[PDB]
């Protein structure tokens, strides 16, 4: 029952133009802030630091999109 | 030493942070949302075509029109089509022109010519006082005139003495004329302009004098700056002769340099360090005291001075520490500061020839002799004729 189903509502062209602008601001600011911040001393007996105050170094996110392999049947 | 090494740990972290931090601020996260900000970015794209031509702005008139010379074809009477105002503009600057309609889009670049690219060695040397092989007293004269009025006006105002517009270094050569200029230039942490005198000599008609005045203009935009005119005598009073296109050339480039430094008064716009390997046999037409005030003369090192040059040197070196520094100097006879440097370098190289790695007491003795011999053969020896 699930190999031929009702495909999602569309990405559309409209939303595609609109989104990039939004993604642009978040994207530079996150990367610029997150990569630069360290709170680590690597020549120390400690690995990083026992945590003094909270860090801003943080990590990224990944969301893919669902598709199943090449078939027409 | 320790301090110098430490500064590097901070600087290693600094490069990494600065490259990320640059990105969020410059734009594409600080993307123009402001009426003023957006208007300049959008408008220049629309007016601009590609190609463009560079020009240098020959004179401006106050009715919103100006006259420019473009690199290609003729000169143009251009309008100020939007953007920059009259005040912003000045003659002798390089401005950007659209080919479609030549107009001044602006400057904010402190010019841009192939000429300026050669002039800007802008990023400072690591060379600094007492990293030099020099005499203690001699560097401290260069600093007093050039550096000190900017750093502390306090001493100069209370005392009541007049600040100069440059200084002049002249030999006996092999005295570290150039080393001194680089030492002071790092300390100000102001942009260091450099040009060699021969570049300003050419067999083209009239090109030379534009460059000579140009040095002072580029520097003024960047200012404070120190302008290093390496071998001034070259444009000046040392020959290009009267039978190669020198006959016209030298007199014009020399004169052009001499009148602005002199002015009508000692202007005091930008400081200058001028290095010359002599003014000893050369002709008068060069800058005199009381525009650049202090003129610095170098000696030929005596026994007592040789202590100051040598102690600096013995530190990088080794095994001339074992033997007293005083005795070594005494033993050697009078020589110029480049010669003293040369003995010390040569000590390190001669050990390698001996089949030893590096300077020993023995290697140091032999190096003294070799340089001395070159000089003794070249010029008069001991006892009269």
Structure characterization notes:
- This is part of a larger assembly, with chains A (73 residues) and B (385 residues).
- Chain A contains one helix and no strands.
- Chain A has one helix spanning 13-36.
- Chain B has 385 residues and is of the alpha/beta class.
- Chain B has helices at residues 2-26, 35-47, 114-119, 136-145, 148-151, 154-159, 177-188, 197-200, 207-222, 246-262, 303-316, 325-331, 337-354, 361-378; strands at 52-61, 65-70, 75-79, 94-98, 167-170, 191-196, 225-230, 271-275, 296-297.
- In chain B, strands 6-7-8-5-9 form a five-stranded parallel β-sheet, with helices on both faces. Chain B has a four-stranded antiparallel β-sheet with strand order 3-2-1-4, with no helix packed on it.
- Chain B is globular, with a radius of gyration of 26 Å.
Percent of residues in beta strands of chain A: under 5%
How far apart are the first and last residues' alpha carbons of chain B, in Å? Answer: 51 Å
Coarse morphology of chain A: elongated
SSE pattern of chain A? H
Helix content of chain A: 25-40%
Shape of chain B: globular
Structural class of chain A: mainly alpha
Number of strands of chain B: 9
Number of helices of chain B: 14
Query: What composes the largest sheet of chain A?
Result: none
Region (Disordered) (chain B): 29-49
GO biological process, one term (chain B): proteasome-mediated ubiquitin-dependent protein catabolic process
GO molecular function, one term (chain B): ATP hydrolysis activity
Biased composition (Basic and acidic residues) (chain B): 31-48
């Amino acid at each position: 029952p699930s190999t031929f189903a009702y495909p999602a509502p569309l990405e559309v062209p409209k939303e595609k133009e609109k989104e990039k602008v939004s993604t642009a601001v978040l994207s530079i600011t996150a990367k610029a802030k997150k990569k630069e911040k360290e709170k680590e001393k690597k020549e120390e007996e400690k690995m990083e630091v026992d945590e003094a105050e909270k860090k801003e170094e943080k990590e990224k996110k990944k969301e893919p999109e669902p598709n199943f392999q090449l078939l027409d049947n | 030493t320790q301090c110098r090494l430490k500064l590097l740990k901070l600087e290693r972290i600094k490069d990494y942070l600065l490259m990320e931090e640059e990105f969020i601020r410059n734009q594409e996260q600080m993307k123009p949302l402001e009426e003023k900000q957006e208007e300049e970015r959008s408008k220049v794209d629309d007016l601009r075509g590609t190609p463009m031509s560079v020009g240098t702005l020959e004179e401006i008139i106050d009715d919103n029109h100006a006259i420019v010379s473009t690199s290609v074809g003729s000169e143009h009477y251009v309008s100020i089509l939007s953007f920059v105002d009259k005040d912003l503009l000045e003659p002798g600057c390089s401005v950007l022109l659209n080919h479609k309609v030549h107009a001044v889009i602006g400057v904010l670049m402190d010019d841009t010519d192939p000429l300026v690219t050669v002039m800007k060695v802008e990023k400072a040397p690591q060379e600094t006082y007492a990293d030099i092989g020099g005499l203690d007293n001699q560097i401290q004269e260069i600093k007093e005139s050039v550096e000190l009025p900017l750093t502390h006006p306090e001493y100069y105002e209370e005392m009541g003495i007049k600040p100069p517009k440059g200084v002049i270094l002249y030999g006996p050569p092999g005295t570290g004329k150039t080393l001194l200029a680089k030492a002071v230039a790092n300390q100000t942490s102001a942009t260091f302009l450099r040009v060699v005198g021969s570049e300003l000599i050419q067999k083209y008609l009239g090109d030379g004098p534009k460059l000579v005045r140009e040095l002072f203009r580029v520097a003024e935009e960047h200012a404070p700056s120190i302008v290093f005119i390496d071998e001034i005598d070259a444009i000046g009073t040392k020959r290009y002769d009267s039978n190669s296109g020198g006959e016209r050339e030298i007199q014009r480039t020399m004169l052009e340099l001499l009148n602005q430094l002199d002015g009508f008064d000692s202007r005091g716009d930008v400081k200058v360090i001028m290095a010359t390997n002599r003014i000893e046999t050369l002709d008068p037409a060069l800058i005199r005291p009381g525009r650049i005030d202090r003129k610095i003369e170098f000696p030929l090192p005596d026994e007592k001075t040789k202590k100051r040059i040598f102690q600096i040197h013995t530190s990088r070196m080794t095994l001339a520490d074992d033997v007293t520094l005083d005795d070594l100097i005494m033993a050697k006879d009078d020589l110029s500061g480049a010669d003293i440097k040369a003995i010390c370098t040569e000590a390190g190289l001669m050990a390698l020839r001996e089949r030893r790695m590096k300077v020993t007491n023995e290697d140091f003795k032999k190096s003294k002799e070799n340089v001395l011999y070159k000089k003794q053969e070249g010029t008069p020896e001991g006892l009269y004729l």
